[PDB]
Amino acid sequence: RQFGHLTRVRHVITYSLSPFEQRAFPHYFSKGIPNVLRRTRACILRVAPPFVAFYLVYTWGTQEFEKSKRKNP
Amino acid sequence: NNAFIDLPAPSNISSWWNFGSLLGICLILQILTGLFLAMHYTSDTTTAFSSVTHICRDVNYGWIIRYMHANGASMFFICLYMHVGRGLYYGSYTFLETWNIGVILLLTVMATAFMGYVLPWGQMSFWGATVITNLLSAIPYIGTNLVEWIWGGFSVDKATLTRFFAFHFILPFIIMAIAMVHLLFLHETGSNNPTGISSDVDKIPFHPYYTIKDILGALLLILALMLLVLFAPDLLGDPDNYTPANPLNTPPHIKPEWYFLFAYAILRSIPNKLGGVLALAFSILILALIPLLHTSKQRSMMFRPLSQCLFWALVADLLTLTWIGGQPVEHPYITIGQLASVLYFLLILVLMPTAGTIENKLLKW
Amino acid sequence: KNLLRNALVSHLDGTTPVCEDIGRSLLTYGRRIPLAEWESRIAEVDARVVREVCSKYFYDQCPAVAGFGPIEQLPDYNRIRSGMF
Amino acid sequence: AAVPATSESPVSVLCRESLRGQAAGRPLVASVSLNVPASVRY
Amino acid sequence: WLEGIRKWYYNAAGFNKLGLMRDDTIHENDDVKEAIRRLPENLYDDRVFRIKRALDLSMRQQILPKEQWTKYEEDKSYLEPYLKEVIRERKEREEWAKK
Amino acid sequence: ADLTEYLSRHYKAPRMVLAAAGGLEHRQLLDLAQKHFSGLSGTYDEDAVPTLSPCRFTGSQICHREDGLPLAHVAIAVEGPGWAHPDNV
Numbered sequence: 001r002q003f004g005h006l007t008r009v010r011h012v013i014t015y016s017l018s019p020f021e022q023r024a025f026p027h028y029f030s031k032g033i034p035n036v037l038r039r040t041r042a043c044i045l046r047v048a049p050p051f052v053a054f055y056l057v058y059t060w061g062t063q064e065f066e067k068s069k070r071k072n073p
Numbered sequence: 074n075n076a077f078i079d080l081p082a083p084s085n086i087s088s089w090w091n092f093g094s095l096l097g098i099c100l101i102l103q104i105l106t107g108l109f110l111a112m113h114y115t116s117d118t119t120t121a122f123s124s125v126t127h128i129c130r131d132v133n134y135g136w137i138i139r140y141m142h143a144n145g146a147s148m149f150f151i152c153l154y155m156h157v158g159r160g161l162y163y164g165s166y167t168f169l170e171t172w173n174i175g176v177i178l179l180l181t182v183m184a185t186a187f188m189g190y191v192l193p194w195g196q197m198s199f200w201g202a203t204v205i206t207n208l209l210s211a212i213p214y215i216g217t218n219l220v221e222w223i224w225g226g227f228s229v230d231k232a233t234l235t236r237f238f239a240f241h242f243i244l245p246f247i248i249m250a251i252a253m254v255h256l257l258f259l260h261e262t263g264s265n266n267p268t269g270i271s272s273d274v275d276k277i278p279f280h281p282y283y284t285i286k287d288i289l290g291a292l293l294l295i296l297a298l299m300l301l302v303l304f305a306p307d308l309l310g311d312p313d314n315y316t317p318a319n320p321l322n323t324p325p326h327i328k329p330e331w332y333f334l335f336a337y338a339i340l341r342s343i344p345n346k347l348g349g350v351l352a353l354a355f356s357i358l359i360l361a362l363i364p365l366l367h368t369s370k371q372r373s374m375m376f377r378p379l380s381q382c383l384f385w386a387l388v389a390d391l392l393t394l395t396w397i398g399g400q401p402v403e404h405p406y407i408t409i410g411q412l413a414s415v416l417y418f419l420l421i422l423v424l425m426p427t428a429g430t431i432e433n434k435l436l437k438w
Numbered sequence: 439k440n441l442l443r444n445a446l447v448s449h450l451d452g453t454t455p456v457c458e459d460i461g462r463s464l465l466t467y468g469r470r471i472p473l474a475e476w477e478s479r480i481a482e483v484d485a486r487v488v489r490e491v492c493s494k495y496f497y498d499q500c501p502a503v504a505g506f507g508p509i510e511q512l513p514d515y516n517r518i519r520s521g522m523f
Numbered sequence: 524a525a526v527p528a529t530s531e532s533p534v535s536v537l538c539r540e541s542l543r544g545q546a547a548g549r550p551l552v553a554s555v556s557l558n559v560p561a562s563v564r565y
Numbered sequence: 566w567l568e569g570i571r572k573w574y575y576n577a578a579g580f581n582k583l584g585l586m587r588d589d590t591i592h593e594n595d596d597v598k599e600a601i602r603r604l605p606e607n608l609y610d611d612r613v614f615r616i617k618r619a620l621d622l623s624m625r626q627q628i629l630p631k632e633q634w635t636k637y638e639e640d641k642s643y644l645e646p647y648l649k650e651v652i653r654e655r656k657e658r659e660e661w662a663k664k
Numbered sequence: 665a666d667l668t669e670y671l672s673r674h675y676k677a678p679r680m681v682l683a684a685a686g687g688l689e690h691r692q693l694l695d696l697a698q699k700h701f702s703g704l705s706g707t708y709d710e711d712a713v714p715t716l717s718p719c720r721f722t723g724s725q726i727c728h729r730e731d732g733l734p735l736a737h738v739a740i741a742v743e744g745p746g747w748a749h750p751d752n753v
């Protein structure tokens with residue numbers, strides 16, 4: 001796969017600046033944090049639950065194990 | 074050039090795409106530290122353990138090369154599992170050749186790390202050699218013969234240690250050749266990306282964009298490796314391997330290396346010899362079936378909520394199995410492990426393909 | 439230098455090109471620079487001067503790039519920028 | 524030569540203004556050079 | 566109402582947030598590639614730009630302003646008539662190959 | 665109105681040059697100049713005097729992709745010195 005033979009594109013214009021003319025960290029915190037927060041919130045419902053379940057199974061099983069090793073659980 | 078410099082790459086691949094180069098680095102690191110350790114290691118059972126302590130105590134910087142090799146093997150697996158997870162989530166497995174070679178790579182690295190762990194001839198070395206080679210005894214009619222043939226005798230002994238040094242020595246170079254083939258098949262298609270949509274309309278050159286990003290990734294890998302080597306070299310290891318091998322006694326709380334714990338939990342959950350071995354083999358080989366189980370009209374899970382939820386359930390389940398593998402075969406761990414083992418195969422064989430079909434329906438195609 | 443000398447003199451051939459050189463030169467230089475002067479300026483250029491003036495304007499300087507048509511293969515700006523050194 | 528041709532070759536009109544001057548008026552002449560783009564007049 | 570979870574799903578899937586239409590996200594196999602090849606200039610060029618805009622947003626880990634999100638009710642299958650015929654043609658050939 | 669405002673501010677005697685080349689004498693040219701361009705304004709005033717500020721150069725790139733055209737055109741340049749600089753030679 002070589003540039004020149006990838007695919008067909010028509011009517012698209014792209015404007016760019018030299019890396020020497022611009023900042024490498026534009027609005028790093030001012031805009032970065034909001035974006036991180038957004039991304040974090042957008043996925044949390046899909047990522048976290050299974051791990052919460054793991055936590056519950058983990059704490060439940062460990063406690064159940066200890067309790068079972070003593071005279072009066 | 075054109076295999077690197079002007080290689081076309083998607084403009085949007087994320088950090089999850091850094092693990093391939095990190096695996097290459099883990100491989101080089103293991104080969105370099107490995108060769109240097111091999112310059113001072115002797116494979117006779119009377120002197121193996123001794124030669125390792127000699128490396129760590131008297132060879133200049135022998136200790137750092139050794140712990141870099143030990144912890145490097147752990148980093149290798151962390152990266153391997155991240156690499157496979159990326160593939161499942163983004164549908165990279167549709168690159169069939171690349172994917173199946175990858176499965177071979179996973180098995181070869183597992184076999185390679187197994188044999189290396191046997192080399193210092195500590196307690197875990199010895200019992201690991203015993204158990205794992207014995208998996209072959211599940212093969213009907215000839216299984217036991219295969220095991221004795223591998224051992225070079227009726228039990229793990231000198232003949233075993235010496236050939237394992239040889240196998241462990243050459244296998245990584247074979248892995249390197251297989252990895253080059255892995256990349257060649259990949260180059261025929263170029264990389265997949267987070268969207269699962271062809272990126273031919275927006276390719277950028279690998280250099281300088283990903284060369285610098287890979288270097289940043291390499292730096293982070295080295296930080297993680299060195300935090301372990303310089304601040305907690307034994308954290309991911311097992312104290313029992315600091316005890317020389319004793320053929321008359323298996324430690325009471327013997328457990329596998331952490332990266333093998335999930336598979337060990339699965340095998341332990343089945344109270345049948347052949348059944349446990351078949352489940353173990355299948356827990357890895359099922360990766361070869363993923364492509365045939367793809368029902369979604371879309372390649373990646375990025376736009377598939379239900380599939381994502383089941384994907385993280387699988388990761389959480391492997392985390393559960395890893396934890397269970399580290400616990401004694403007692404209540405309620407026996408049952409939690411059996412459920413987790415069943416859930417593993419159920420998510421892959423039934424729930425995910427089903428979520429794929431439901432999502433298609435919801436999109437009306 | 440020889441190519442330049444020939445281009446200068448052959449261009450100022452005919453009343454129109456000379457008339458234009460007069461009008462534009464007064465606006466740009468504020469005077470008509472005679473061929474003998476251009477000759478002196480040209481004669482003084484040697485390999486050293488060419489290296490120094492080219493280095494001054496081309497060497498490790500950011501270029502401006504414009505592309506139009508089937509340009510999938512036009513190099514990326516960073517790659518073009520690194521070609522400046 | 525030193526001077527580049529008026530039009531470099533390789534291998535729009537929509538108004539009456541841009542069309543004026545397009546009609547031929549003299550016999551054809553073909554030129555070929557060592558250093559300059561070829562041309563064909565008339 | 567199924568339809569209720571459908572609009573919910575559409576927004577949860579989120580390709581609309583990148584300005585994509587459902588058909589822009591289909592996995593490309595040979596049938597799909599042939600169908601894309603058969604698209605008229607305008608549908609092809611529009612697809613290319615939407616995918617390009619989406620890849621760009623993905624690279625910046627960004628999304629479009631909500632007002633620019635593809636709307637569920639306005640998403641239509643521009644690829645369907647083409648892909649359906651390509652599949653029909655292949656099935657016909659496969660039937661003939663068995664006779 | 666835009667055109668007259670533009671011409672008003674820009675077409676001033678001090679910004680123009682009557683040039684001639686050929687079989688003619690400078691004295692006749694000048695006399696004709698005096699005869700026909702004398703009434704040419706030499707003062708818009710002081711509130712107009714259009715003056716050029718320098719123009720910043722930006723290392724950058726503009727790519728208009730159009731695979732429908734048979735050949736690609738590419739133009740690349742660095743910032744040059746300006747008319748009056750000796751370096752131009």
Ligand code: HEM
Nearest residue numbers: 090092093094096097160165166175176178179252264265
């Ligand atoms: C010694 C082990 C391995 C090495 C050195 C290795 C290396 C690589 C490299 C260099 C890449 C490109 C960068 C990237 O996208 O990550 C890659 C891509 C890929 N590898 Fe591996 N690999 C290894 C094991 C595996 C395994 C175990 C699997 C999965 C069972 C696998 C599946 C893939 C797939 C499907 C791709 C394409 C990724 C995409 O474009 O999305 N690899 N590998």
Ligand code: HEM
Nearest residue numbers: 103104107108110111114143146186189190192193242245
């Ligand atoms: C895929 C790459 C490799 C992996 C995953 C790997 C893994 C391992 C593991 C897990 C051990 C046990 C470490 C311990 O706790 O002591 C080991 C030991 C060892 N490895 Fe490797 N190894 C690799 C490549 C190599 C190569 C190429 C050589 C030598 C040519 C090598 C030489 C050694 C030697 C001599 C030892 C014994 C001393 C020691 O235990 O540190 N390894 N290896």
Ligand SMILES: C/C=C(C)/C=C/C=C/[C@H](OC)[C@@H](C)[C@@H](OC)[C@@H](C)CCc1oc2c(O)c(OC)cc(OC)c2c(=O)c1C
Nearest residue numbers: 180183184187197200201204206328329330333336337340
């Ligand atoms: C000559 C070469 C030979 C014979 C190579 C054989 C390779 C086999 C497989 O690799 C492909 C194998 C390593 C891989 O199975 C897929 C692992 C996940 C198996 C994990 C594994 O580890 C254990 C371990 O490490 C131990 O350590 C002290 C102790 C163990 O129980 C007491 C185990 C164990 O019960 C299992 C299942």
